[PDB]
Structure formats: structure tokens, C-alpha cells
Amino acid sequence: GVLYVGSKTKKGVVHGVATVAEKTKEQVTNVGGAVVTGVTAVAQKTVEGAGSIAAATGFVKKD
Amino acid sequence: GVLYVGSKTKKGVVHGVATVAEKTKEQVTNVGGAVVTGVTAVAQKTVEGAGSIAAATGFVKKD
Amino acid sequence: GVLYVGSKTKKGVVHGVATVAEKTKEQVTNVGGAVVTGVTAVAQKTVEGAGSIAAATGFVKKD
Amino acid sequence: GVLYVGSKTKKGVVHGVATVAEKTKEQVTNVGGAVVTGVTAVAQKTVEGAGSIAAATGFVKKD
Amino acid sequence: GVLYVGSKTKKGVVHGVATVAEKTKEQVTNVGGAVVTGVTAVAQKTVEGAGSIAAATGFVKKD
Amino acid sequence: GVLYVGSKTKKGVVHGVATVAEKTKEQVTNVGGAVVTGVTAVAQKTVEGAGSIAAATGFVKKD
Amino acid sequence: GVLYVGSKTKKGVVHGVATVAEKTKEQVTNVGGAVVTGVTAVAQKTVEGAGSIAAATGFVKKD
Amino acid sequence: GVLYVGSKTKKGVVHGVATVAEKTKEQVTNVGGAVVTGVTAVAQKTVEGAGSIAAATGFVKKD
Amino acid sequence: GVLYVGSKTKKGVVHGVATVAEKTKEQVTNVGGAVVTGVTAVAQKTVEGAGSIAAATGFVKKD
Amino acid sequence: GVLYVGSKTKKGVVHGVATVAEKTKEQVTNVGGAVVTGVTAVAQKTVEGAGSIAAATGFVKKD
Ligand SMILES: [Cl-]
Ligand SMILES: [Cl-]
Ligand SMILES: [Cl-]
Ligand SMILES: [Cl-]
Ligand SMILES: [Cl-]
Ligand SMILES: [Cl-]
Ligand SMILES: [Cl-]
Ligand SMILES: [Cl-]
Ligand SMILES: [Cl-]
Ligand SMILES: [Cl-]
């Protein structure tokens, strides 16, 4: 395959993932993949395989 | 396949994932994929395989 | 296949996923896919496989 | 197949998914797919496979 | 495959992953993938194998 | 004159003046006299004088 | 004059003047007299004089 | 005059004047008299004089 | 005059004037008299004079 | 005059004037009289004179 990404900017301001917690208990931010962040941002992922598992859970409690 | 992404901007302001928690208990932000964020943002993913599982759960409690 | 995405903007302001929780208990934001966010935003996903499962659940409680 | 997306804007202000929870208990926002958000936003998904399952549930409680 | 990423900017200001915690207990930020952040940001990942597992969990408690 | 006040209690819970204001504009609680509050509460006031004025107003707006 | 105040208690819980203001604008609590607060609370006031003025106003706005 | 105040308690818990203000603008608590607060609380005031003025105002705004 | 104040307690917990302000602008607590606070609290005031003024104002703004 | 104040306690915990300010602007606590605070607290004040002025104001702004 082919990918072309041209970009042209004067002023760019980019936040990506921001968290704020005040006086809280048990705050979770969970990302299963990559975090990719830019004035120009490109991400490619390929997974080959008969039993691929991707699992993303915030939290587990037992008992 | 072919992908072309041209972009042309003067001023761009981009937030991606923002969380605020005040005085809370058990706040979860869970993302199963990638987080991709930009003035120009491109994401490609390919999964090949007979039994691919993707699971995203905020939280599990037992007992 | 072919995809062409041209864009032209002067001023762009983009939020993506924003959460606010005050004095709450058990707040969940759960996204099964990617989060892709931009002045220009493009996402492609391909899944090939006879028994693909995608599951997204906020929370599970037992007992 | 072919997709062409041209766009031309002066001022664009885009929110995507926003949640606010105050003094609540058990607030859930659950998205089974991707979240794609932009001044120009494009999403493609292809699923090939004889028994594809897609499930999105807010919450499960037992007992 | 082929990837081309051209970018042209005058002023770019980019944050990546930012966390703030005040007076909290048990705050977690967990990223399963890479964090890639730049005025131009490019990430590629390839995974080959019949039983690939990717798991990302904020926290586990037992008893 | 004579005043006798005997009291005998096991458990006494006494609030006096309580105000709650949420998201309001211009809430006033105005008391012209004393506030006297107790499990046993006694108040005496004597005013001697030919032109005694007592005035209690919540608010005045002009123009 | 004579005042006698006997009191006898096991458990006494007394609040006096309590205010709560959230997200409000211009909340006023105004008491013209004393605030006297106790498990046993006694207040006496004597005013002698031909032109005694007592005035209690929450707020005044002009123009 | 004569005042007698006997009191007898096992457990006494007394608040007097409590204010809480969150995110508000221009919150006022104004007391013209004394604040007297105790498990036993006694207040006496005498004013002698032909033109006594007592004034208690939360706030004044002009122009 | 005569005042007698006897008191007899095992456990006494007394607050007097408490203020809490979070994220507010222009919070005022104003007391014109004394603040007297004790397990046993006694206050006496005498004012003699033809033109006694007592004034208690939270705030004044002009222009 | 005569004042007698007897007191008898095992455990006494007394706060007097407590202020807390977080992230606020222009918080004022203003007391015109004395602050007197004790397990036993007694205050006496006498004012003699034809034109006694007592004034207590939180703040004044002009222009
Ligand atoms: Cl950030
Ligand atoms: Cl963000
Ligand atoms: Cl956002
Ligand atoms: Cl949003
Ligand atoms: Cl950062
Ligand atoms: Cl109260
Ligand atoms: Cl109170
Ligand atoms: Cl208090
Ligand atoms: Cl206090
Ligand atoms: Cl204190």
C-alpha cells in the first residue's frame, strides 16, 4: 500500500492526553494502543496471527 | 490501497482526550485502541487472524 | 481502494473526548476503538478472520 | 472503491464526545467503535468473517 | 509498502501525555503502546505470531 | 419579674439557622434580633425609649 | 429581676448559624444581634435611650 | 438584677458560626453583635444613651 | 448586679467561628463584637453615652 | 457588680477562630472586638463616653 501525508500550518497547538485529579480516589486513564501526537501525527499497526488478543481494562477488584 | 491526506491550516488548536475529576471516587477512562491526535491525524490498523478478540472494559468487581 | 482527503481551513478548534466528574462515584468512559482527532482526521481499520469478537462494556459487578 | 472528501472552511469549532457528571453515581459512556473527530473527519471500517460479533453494553450487574 | 510524511510549520507547540494529581490517592496513567510525540510524529508497529497477547490494565486488587 | 427555666434531657440535637444556596444569585438571610440556640435557650430584651425604631430589610436596589 | 436557668443533659449536639454556598453569586447572612450558642445558652440585652435605632439590611445597591 | 446559670452535661459538641463557600463570588457573613459560644454560654449587654445606633449591613455597592 | 455561672462537664468539644473558602472570590466574615468561646463562655459589655454608634458592614464598593 | 464563674471539666477541646482558604482571592476575617478562648473564657468590656464609635468593615474599594 501507499500513504502520503502532506501538511502545512502556521500556528499549531496540540494537546494529547491530559488528566487532572483533585481530591479523588482511584482515578485511572488506560490506553491499550500507542499514544501518537504531533502537528502531523501518523500511526500504522499490523497484527498477523490466528488468535490475537487485545484487552484493555481500567481495574479489577476481587474480594 | 492508496491514501492521500493533504491539509492546509493557519491556526489549529486540538485537544485529544481530556479528563477532569474532582472529589470523585473510581473515575475511569479506558481506550482500547490507539490515541492519535494532530493538526493532521491519520491512523491505519490491520488485523488478520481467524479468532481475533478485542475487549475493552472499564472495571470489573467480584464479591 | 483509493481515499483522497483534502482540507483547507483558517481557524480550527477541535476537542475530542472530554470528561468532567465532580463529587461522583463510579464514572466510566470506555471506547472500544481508536480515538483519532485532528483538524484533519482519518481512520481506517480492516479485520479479516472467521470469528472476530469486538466487545466494549462499561463495567461488570458480581455479588 | 473510491472516496473523495474535499472541505473548505474559515472557522470550525468541533466537540466530539463530552460528558459531565455532578454528584451522580454510576454514570457510563460506552462507545463500541472508534471516535473520529475533526474539522474534516473520515472513518472506514471493513470486517470480513463468517461469525463476526460486535457487542456494546453499558453495564452488567449480577446478584 | 511506502509511507511519505511531509510537514511544514512556522510555530508548533505540542504536549504529549500530561498528568496532574493533587491530594488524590491511587491515580494511574497506563499506556500499553509507545508514546511518540513531535512536531512531526510517526509510529509503525508490526506483530507476527499465532498467539499475540496485548494487555493493558490500570490496577489489580485481590483480597 | 422572675423567670425560672429548668430542663432535663438525655439526647438533644439542635440546629439554629441553616442556609444552603446552590447556583443561585442574590440569596439573603437577614435576622434583625439575636440568634440564640441551645439545648436550653433563653433570650431577654428590654427597650426603653420614646422613638425606638427596629427595621429589618432583605435588600434595597435603586436605579 | 431574677433569672434562673438550670440544665441537665447527657448528650447535646448544637449547631448555631451554618451557611453553605456553592457556585452562587452574592450570598449574604446578616445578623443584627449577638449570636449565642451553647448546650445552655442565655442572652440578655437592655437598651435605654429616647431614640434608639436598630437596622439590619442584607445589601444595598444603587445605580 | 440577678442571673444564675447552672449546667451539667456528660458529652457536649457545639459549633458556633460555620461558613462554607465553594466556587462562589461575594459571599458575606456579618454579625453585628458578639459571638459567644460554649458548652455553657452567657452574654449580657447594656446600652445607655439617648441616640444609640446599631447598624448591620452585608454589603453596599454604588455606581 | 450579680452573675453566677457554674458548669460541670465530662467531655466538651467547642468550635467558635470557622470559615472555609475554596476557589471563591471576595469572601468576608465580619464580627462587630468580641468572639468569646470556651467550654464555659461568659461575655459582658456596657456602653454609656448619648450617641453611641455600632456599625458592622461586610464590604463597600464605589465606582 | 459581682461575677462568679466556676467550671469543672475532664476533657475539653476548644477551637476559637479558624479560617481556611484554598485557591481563593480576597478572603477576609475581621473581628472588631477581642478574641477570648479557653476551657473557661470570660470577657468584660466597659466603654464610657458621649460619642463612642465602633466600626468593623471587611473591605472598602473605591474607583
Ligand atoms: Cl497533554
Ligand atoms: Cl487533551
Ligand atoms: Cl478533549
Ligand atoms: Cl469533547
Ligand atoms: Cl506533556
Ligand atoms: Cl445551623
Ligand atoms: Cl454552625
Ligand atoms: Cl464553628
Ligand atoms: Cl473554629
Ligand atoms: Cl482556631
DSSP string, D22-45: ES-EEEEEEESS-EEEEEEEEEEE
CA distance J20 to chain I (A): 5
Half-sphere exposure of residue C58, counting CA atoms within 13 Å on the CB side?
17
Residues contacting J27, CB < 8 A, separation 6+:
I19, I21, I24, I27, I28, J19, J21
Residue with cell 474534516: D40
Q: How crowded is residue F17: how many other Cβ atoms within 10 Å of its Cβ?
A: 17
Supply the DSSP string of J3-63, one letter for each residue.
EEEEEEEEEEEE--EEEEEES-EEEEEEESS-EEEEEEEEEEEEEE-TT-EEEEEEEEEE-
Cβ <8 Å between A54 and E54: yes
Question: What's the CA-to-centroid distance between B6 and ligand 3, angstroms?
Answer: 24
Distance between CA atoms of residues H60 and I56, nearest Å: 12
Question: What's the CA-to-centroid distance between D37 and ligand 4, angstroms?
Answer: 9
- Which chain B residues have any C-beta within 8 angstroms of a chain D C-beta? 7, 33, 41, 50, 58
Nearest to B17 by CA among E48, D16, A1, H58: D16
- SS3 per residue for E4-18: EEEEEEEEEEECCEE
**Which residues in chain J are contacts of H14 at CB distance < 8 A?**
none
Enter the C-alpha cell of residue A21.
485529579
Edge-first strand listing for the sheet containing I53-62: F53-62, G53-62, H53-62, I53-62, J53-62
Provide the total of helices (H) and of strands (E) in chain B, helices listed first.
0, 5
Nearest to A16 by CA among E26, E13, E58, B26: E13
What's the helix, strand, coil split of chain I in %, to 5?
Answer: 0, 80, 20
Burial class of residue D52 (count of CB atoms within 10 Å of its CB; 0-12, 13-18, 19+):
middle
Distance between CA atoms of residues G22 and G25, nearest Å: 9
**Which residues in chain B are contacts of D34 at CB distance < 8 A?**
33
Write the residue in H34, H40, H49 that is nearest to J33 by C-beta: H34
**Which residues in chain B are contacts of D38 at CB distance < 8 A?**
41
The pair phi, psi for residue I45, each rounded to 5°, is -135, 135
The pair phi, psi for residue E28, each rounded to 5°, is -130, 135
Write the residue in B34, B40, B49 that is nearest to E33 by C-beta: B34
Enter the C-alpha cell of residue F15.
440546629
- SS3 per residue for F2-63: EEEEEEEEEEEEECCEEEEEECCEEEEEEECCCEEEEEEEEEEEEEECCCCEEEEEEEEEEC
Edge-first strand listing for the sheet containing C17-22: D17-22, C17-22, B17-22, A17-22, E17-22
Q: Which residue of G has its CA nearest to H10?
A: G10
Helix (H, G, I), strand (E, B) or coil at C16: coil
N-terminal to C-terminal alpha carbon distance within chain G: 50
Q: How crowded is residue B39: how many other Cβ atoms within 10 Å of its Cβ?
A: 35
Distance between CA atoms of residues G6 and F41, nearest Å: 11
Question: What's the CA-to-centroid distance between D29 and ligand 2, angstroms?
Answer: 18
Cβ <8 Å between J13 and I12: yes
Distance between CA atoms of residues D43 and I32, nearest Å: 67
Residues contacting E39, CB < 8 A, separation 6+:
A12, A38, A39, A40, E7, E9, E12, E14
β-partners of residue I56 are H56, J56
Nearest to B38 by CA among E12, G17, J5: E12
Cβ <8 Å between C38 and B37: yes
Asked whether I and H share 3 or more beta-carbon pairs under 8 angstroms, the answer is yes
**Which residues in chain I are contacts of J6 at CB distance < 8 A?**
5-7
Ligand 4 (single-atom ion) residues, CB below 5 Å: C 15, 18; D 15-16, 18
Question: What's the CA-to-centroid distance between E15 and ligand 2, angstroms?
Answer: 9
Check: CB of residue A52 under 8 Å from CB of residue E48.
Answer: no
Helix (H, G, I), strand (E, B) or coil at I52: coil
The pair phi, psi for residue C24, each rounded to 5°, is -90, 165
Which amino acid type is present at position F39? V
- Residue G15 in marked binding region: yes
Which amino acid type is present at position I52? S
Helix (H, G, I), strand (E, B) or coil at C5: strand
Enter the C-alpha cell of residue H18.
460555620
**Which residues in chain C are contacts of D4 at CB distance < 8 A?**
4
